[PDB]
Amino acid sequence: DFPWLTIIVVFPISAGSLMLFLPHRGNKVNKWYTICICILELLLTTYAFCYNFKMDDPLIQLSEDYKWIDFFDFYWRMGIDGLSIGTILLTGFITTLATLAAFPVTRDSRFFHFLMLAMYSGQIGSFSSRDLLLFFIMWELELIPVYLLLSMWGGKKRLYSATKFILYTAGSSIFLLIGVLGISLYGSNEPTLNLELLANKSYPVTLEILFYIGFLIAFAVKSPIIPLHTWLPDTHGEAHYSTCMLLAGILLKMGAYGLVRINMELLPHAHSMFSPWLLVVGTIQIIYAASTSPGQRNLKKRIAYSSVSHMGFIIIGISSITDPGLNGAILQIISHGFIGAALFFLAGTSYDRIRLVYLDEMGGMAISIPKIFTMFTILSMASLALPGMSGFIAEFIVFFGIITSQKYFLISKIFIIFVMAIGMILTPIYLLSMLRQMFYGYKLINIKNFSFFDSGPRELFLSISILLPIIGIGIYPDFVLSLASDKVESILSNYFY
Template sequence: MSNLPWLTIIVLLPTPAGSSIPFLPSANNRIIRWYALGICLLEFLLITYVFSCQFRIKDESIQLLEDYVWIGITNFHWRLGVDGLSMSLILLTGFVTTPAILAAWPVTRNTRLFHFSMLAMYSGQIGLFASQDLLLFFLMWELELIPIYLLLSIWGGKRRIYSATKFLLYTAGGSLFLLLASLTMGLYGSYETSFDIQILAKKSYPITLEIILYLGFLITYAVKLPIYPFHTWLPDTHGEAHYSTCMLLAGILLKMGGYGLIRINMELLPHAHSIFSPWLVTIGAIQILYASLISFSQRNLKRRIAYSSVSHMGFVTIGIGSITSMGLNGAMLQMISHGLIGAALFFLAGTSYDRTRTLLLNNLGGLAIPMPKLFVMFSFFSLASLALPGTSGFVAESMVFLGVITNNYYSSVLEGFVVATGAIGTVLTPIYLLSMLRQMFYGYRISNVWVSYLIDIGPRETFIMVCLLLPIIGIGIYPNLVLSLWKSKVESISYQYN
């Protein structure tokens, strides 16, 4: 069993299995839903097995390495492997995608294509986190575009074509820089052409070339993370996408940018990262404050949560820029935490829309009486988002700030600016989130009188919420539950900057 190509099986399973969906009976969408959910459950069980039985937590090296020559003339390999960083994000992918498929139960139009697109995203996301070849990394990065574009343009809101096109232009434009930088790294030097990430880590580049390469990768990842000012696609996309799609976007897609910054920029281009790290922490702090202020002006529920995501991902940027093990641990923990909290908030926004048929906060009010379960869940995840002590967000954001303070290379002025700006944004977060809760659940309904027709969340929706709730509390109480997964890897990365 240990000799099986487990990573290849995990990466490829969702897409080929999803390809049989067109041949399922069309008379009842129930069969399609249960089939897609069964694939996700099987995939998650395989991921859990590989993690628990094949993966060594304290080993910082690349494990379960699989290497097959794909296109020999170009030295393009199917090369997969995992360490603590990638394994934790693969677990997050499985943990968020399965509830997202369950959340898509109300979708009744073109269910075959919808569920196949969701499964194709599943393969691409796991493939990206497991890639150990830079061209394969680029391929998996690109494979995300088509299913997301379909999910946006077919099942989105009134401005779905605009938001899907904007997403495609932003991400495709960023991907061009990823391709050029990847080709340059692989072809540079007198050695044999190789895109093996482990071999590229041993290469050295002239500082000018390293800075150019760093900027190319940074632009790509800045779009996905997203880093200010490359973030404008995100509110439009989240505002129009179906909430099950939003769960994947917030829970996993944004983490691809943070992972790329750590895996490529930090590991392969350390000298350039040392130069750009003060700028990253500065931009991250500004992003937290800027997105928090913009959230106040959003009257659309999903757009307010979207700008909240932009603000929270600023902590990831700061943690990566801090170049300390404390800050980098905080950045990874923030990605996991936000993946769970962000997915939950967008799901709750979607369930609210299914019942009220509006996302405008001005048209909501008094929902706590007819829907007390929704009120309790929305309140909990909003408190988790504002980093209430005892939740995963509190630990992550605290570690990021400590990582900046303990960096001996930054001036006290820069440290003070980052901490002060980030702290103001942190103070603003509970204001706009609690204001959102007040507008939704308190007071009187303004636009309608259909209180008696509102139905509270049911068993399926409660089950999804509990699945996302438990790890948020578990990590908040015992952070080492997940920190141990990548601790040794983070220490080895940050060691080269000390």
């Protein structure tokens, strides 16, 4: 009918490649050019999502297939699921607000905003592609640009974190390549790559477990799984707020979404073997990443471990073979996208205002920056799984998917729920420790001579714009469930028989 997803995906790069030299040597022109491009792309995404996306049909919509390389059977397969459209809209929203938050950047702002648009294309390419090797292309295409907007923008030891991240992510993308090679070649007669043609194959268990290992080592670092999670506290905690609010906002969700696409509905009989252990891993992950966070003096590494902790509920909902579990996983993907994005945004602006990082220093700054104080408090409440925010309904529907699970038995459900809900005691501890360390207090040397600037209207709009979906999803969760739940049944129909 019309190449929709293609002009979604290629448009940021094809519009940032119009900045070849573009002799305007201030940040104004390219800043406004690229925020205009990002708004245009977000509106294209919405007009695809509103008037050309049926929310009831749990099948591939806006499908589009070309022929790129005939030897690999490598197409340009594009497609939207119920579990992928939410991540696509989240990509649009969060990357748009990221380039909004990057308004004050002026170092090499042309290159910065171009790499932002490159990430903006690559993430939607990873979420919208129904071809395995194309999923790998758009996985590794959001690897160099993130490196370049992580090593030259943001963070003290930015070079260490950037090389750690790029080598960790490449050393896992090679496992992803082992997986796609295994499935494509040793999948069946007539080797293919189209996931739509691939989701109804045999894959005997001695080979399905091998593919599941090859893909779980790939997605275990992007959605951090606690053996392989050390890239995040260095990467997020030493990055700029505009990059970090999509490193946690949408880049962390591939790997959680991937565990749904190429693990949950492509390798179901092996996921039925591996999810019992992914459950224990996620339950230990919540506690581990909620107990490491009080260990961090740093402000931003605290929120990086917070993201490692909140990914545990997504790991649990994925390993919960249920409709509630996976719907809670997708809902937590989106909820923590908003939450972690805005939290890293506010931590970066707080560092820019205060120019202090550790929580031992940086005492009471609430009277100095009250707007930042209240937005950080509201978003800590949203991180807290507080009702009225999307975090609560996420971190409750995942519990409900546990307690209504047919896979697991009560002797295990009790232990799992207990270790999960200790997480919501430990999460108050670190979040309100951060709040009382960085905002509650009085420093006698900071009386009036500093008089820092408050949250400007731009940053206030950032935080409020990321808050309103959190509130709207806390008061009415079916802004996120209703676009996925039907598709979730199309997952679980592969599991019960």
